[PDB]
Amino acid sequence: TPVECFEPSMLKKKQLTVLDLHPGGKTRRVLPEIVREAIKTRLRTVILAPTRVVAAEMEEALRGLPVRYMTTATEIVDLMCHATFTSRLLQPIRVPNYNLYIMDEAHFTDPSSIAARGYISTRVEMGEAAAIFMTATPPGTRDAFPDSNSPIMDTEVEVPERAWSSGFDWVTDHSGKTVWFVPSVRNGNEIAACLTKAGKRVIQLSRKTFETEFQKTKHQEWDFVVTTDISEMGANFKADRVIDSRRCLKPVILDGERVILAGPMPVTHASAAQRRGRIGRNPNKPGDEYLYGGGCAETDEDHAHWLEARMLLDNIYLQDGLIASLYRPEADKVAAIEGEFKLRTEQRKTFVELMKRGDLPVWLAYQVASAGITYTDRRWCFDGTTNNTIMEDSVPAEVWTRHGEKRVLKPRWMDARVCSDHAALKSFKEFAAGKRAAA
């Protein structure tokens, strides 16, 4: 069961604590308290932030303490993102044996975060570490309307799911700042364009743009942020209203053979609570409003992220021949057998390269690597079934390859995430051509 405040006994090996977060001070006060006690007791500590934005915030709150920010993959506390940590676990050189792991926004359901929680909770169960998972919505939360620092006015209302030509005056007649959660980048593009046509200033946030676009919320005028679920991970906005579609997309592996994006479908209770949790933060500012369009539903056993986390953990060294388990509250989300995704050395390197350098989803990188294909061999992007033809502007997408041939994009394994929005398709087309954008 989660806990309300930190105590030094939580730093002893074998302890795993879920600590609640009500900002409005985890970053500025609680985190320094934990780090100071860890330094005083001479622990080997790592702090895991969900995003680089949050990591930079922590770096500021911890200045004056010996903390090493590690932006890419007992005297010094290490700080890095969840994904950076998991990337390090996959590298051939062994990660430090931290004996204290502090994971902020520990509800994050992306595969690298799930994998990090499994690795960490396994180290704790082995008696090698303590861990603190900081989140207001641990796995299994069923309350979409938790009590908050200031009361929130919760109103169920019809929320536009597409651009509107009339109606919905309540959306645009508000004079404050609104965070609008959408199920996908493409849906956000359409909503954002409609708001901009109405004269609103809109900033759009997604996983690929977050680390550079989020800063715009502090430096330019804005009326709406239109964001995917990425803003459920500690994103702080000066807003008085949240509009919540209550929808998400779900990547689903159909028959072990392809990945579709199912939905839009209802969000989890934790996601709804985190979306609503962008407001209600200041006890001296009442009147924040959460407007929501439908219900919640708990994640089925078919969400690809937990299977992808097992693909990662099956390829992460732990201790001799052991493989880490998922964190127990999340372990029933898969039926995969421990070790069924373990790859041999050379295929494992290719798997990591396809994710890190190719920017491919975990599942897709696994298919390619397990087929024995090397990282630079892109023939599989073009030799699939015509059912896998990728479309661009209603016609088949075509790529000029490194080898000087024009080919229809038709990958042997189809993962809908590679073409779900313009930027995703652009990156995958570059990969298929043997090229890579400077990033």
Side-chain angles (χ1 to χ4, degrees):
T1 60
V3 312
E4 291 150 2
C5 73
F6 167 72
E7 299 290 350
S9 59
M10 297 170 182
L11 304 188
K12 294 298 196 307
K13 288 189 251 282
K14 299 183 205 256
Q15 294 302 123
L16 194 148
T17 303
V18 180
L19 183 55
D20 206 343
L21 298 188
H22 307 129
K26 168 209 72 72
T27 312
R28 70 190 189 93
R29 184 167 165 176
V30 181
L31 187 63
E33 184 176 320
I34 301 173
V35 173
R36 287 192 203 93
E37 185 68 12
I39 293 168
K40 177 144 296 182
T41 52
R42 289 168 281 95
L43 305 179
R44 304 182 303 272
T45 303
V46 66
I47 307 170
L48 303 178
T51 65
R52 282 308 151 176
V53 174
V54 171
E57 297 175 1
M58 295 174 161
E59 189 182 31
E60 194 188 275
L62 297 171
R63 71 189 195 277
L65 299 176
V67 180
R68 176 180 70 163
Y69 193 17
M70 291 158 66
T71 184
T72 52
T74 69
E75 292 228 60
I76 308 292
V77 177
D78 288 345
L79 168 63
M80 67 192 69
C81 291
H82 299 183
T84 297
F85 175 78
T86 299
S87 179
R88 288 177 54 90
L89 296 179
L90 288 159
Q91 307 305 286
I93 300 170
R94 291 315 145 210
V95 75
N97 293 133
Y98 302 110
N99 51 30
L100 174 65
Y101 298 91
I102 305 166
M103 178 179 256
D104 188 30
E105 312 295 351
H107 56 281
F108 198 0
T109 60
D110 278 14
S112 60
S113 296
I114 300 170
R117 285 192 296 279
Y119 178 91
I120 291 168
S121 61
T122 295
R123 287 292 187 199
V124 173
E125 319 270 31
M126 299 166 75
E128 297 185 351
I132 298 178
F133 285 178
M134 305 190 294
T135 176
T137 60
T141 296
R142 300 297 162 89
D143 188 9
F145 305 97
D147 288 319
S148 46
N149 295 341
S150 184
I152 297 164
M153 296 194 296
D154 297 309
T155 314
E156 198 179 21
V157 70
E158 184 182 8
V159 169
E161 310 172 333
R162 50 190 175 96
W164 60 101
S165 64
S166 71
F168 298 106
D169 273 353
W170 64 264
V171 172
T172 50
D173 291 341
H174 188 70
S175 61
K177 284 180 164 44
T178 300
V179 179
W180 188 331
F181 282 94
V182 292
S184 72
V185 172
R186 283 221 172 96
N187 183 250
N189 292 340
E190 182 175 346
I191 293 301
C194 189
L195 290 169
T196 295
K197 168 174 54 78
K200 302 302 180 182
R201 284 76 54 84
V202 182
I203 295 166
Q204 294 181 248
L205 302 178
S206 68
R207 278 164 177 78
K208 191 239 186 70
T209 66
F210 188 83
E211 307 283 16
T212 70
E213 285 297 290
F214 175 82
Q215 53 83 17
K216 289 184 176 177
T217 66
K218 308 180 216 119
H219 298 107
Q220 59 194 53
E221 305 167 36
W222 63 270
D223 305 310
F224 288 77
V225 162
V226 171
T227 178
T228 64
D229 66 316
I230 187 57
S231 288
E232 293 170 20
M233 264 56 65
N236 303 316
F237 304 96
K238 292 178 180 300
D240 63 357
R241 188 169 71 159
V242 168
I243 295 178
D244 192 355
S245 63
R246 288 273 186 100
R247 300 294 212 173
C248 62
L249 291 186
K250 180 170 64 169
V252 177
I253 306 161
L254 281 190
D255 299 282
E257 291 161 1
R258 65 191 300 106
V259 172
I260 64 165
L261 281 163
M265 74 179 49
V267 297
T268 64
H269 293 83
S271 287
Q274 289 287 0
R275 292 181 182 192
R276 177 177 178 270
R278 300 312 90 197
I279 56 174
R281 298 191 161 199
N282 182 347
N284 297 124
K285 191 188 181 188
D288 291 349
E289 188 177 24
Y290 175 70
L291 298 110
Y292 63 103
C296 302
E298 281 314 295
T299 295
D300 219 336
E301 54 194 20
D302 67 349
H303 194 302
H305 283 184
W306 283 267
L307 192 148
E308 292 180 304
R310 287 253 36 101
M311 290 175 160
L312 300 179
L313 287 173
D314 281 349
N315 292 282
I316 286 165
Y317 179 83
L318 180 68
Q319 185 179 91
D320 295 316
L322 283 171
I323 286 174
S325 299
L326 296 173
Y327 176 44
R328 188 218 62 76
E330 328 175 74
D332 70 330
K333 309 224 170 149
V334 304
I337 307 298
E338 180 186 296
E340 75 167 74
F341 305 113
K342 177 179 176 54
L343 293 172
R344 334 154 184 173
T345 304
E346 219 56 50
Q347 299 189 348
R348 201 198 68 94
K349 182 186 80 166
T350 300
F351 174 51
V352 175
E353 289 178 343
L354 289 163
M355 292 181 292
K356 194 71 170 182
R357 302 290 301 168
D359 200 29
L360 299 190
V362 178
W363 180 89
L364 180 58
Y366 181 84
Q367 308 311 312
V368 177
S370 65
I373 297 171
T374 197
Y375 175 64
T376 54
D377 178 6
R378 309 290 153 84
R379 287 176 291 173
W380 67 272
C381 296
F382 308 105
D383 64 11
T385 291
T386 70
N387 286 331
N388 290 358
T389 302
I390 290 179
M391 303 297 165
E392 179 169 26
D393 301 315
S394 179
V395 298
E398 295 192 271
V399 171
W400 278 104
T401 72
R402 203 162 66 133
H403 305 110
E405 315 183 281
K406 192 181 185 179
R407 295 181 179 271
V408 174
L409 191 58
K410 192 174 56 171
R412 203 182 300 171
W413 300 274
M414 188 61 223
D415 187 319
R417 295 169 291 184
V418 305
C419 55
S420 55
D421 63 53
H422 176 275
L425 176 62
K426 177 176 178 290
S427 296
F428 188 63
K429 285 172 61 186
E430 289 163 347
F431 170 87
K435 292 180 159 50
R436 191 174 176 275

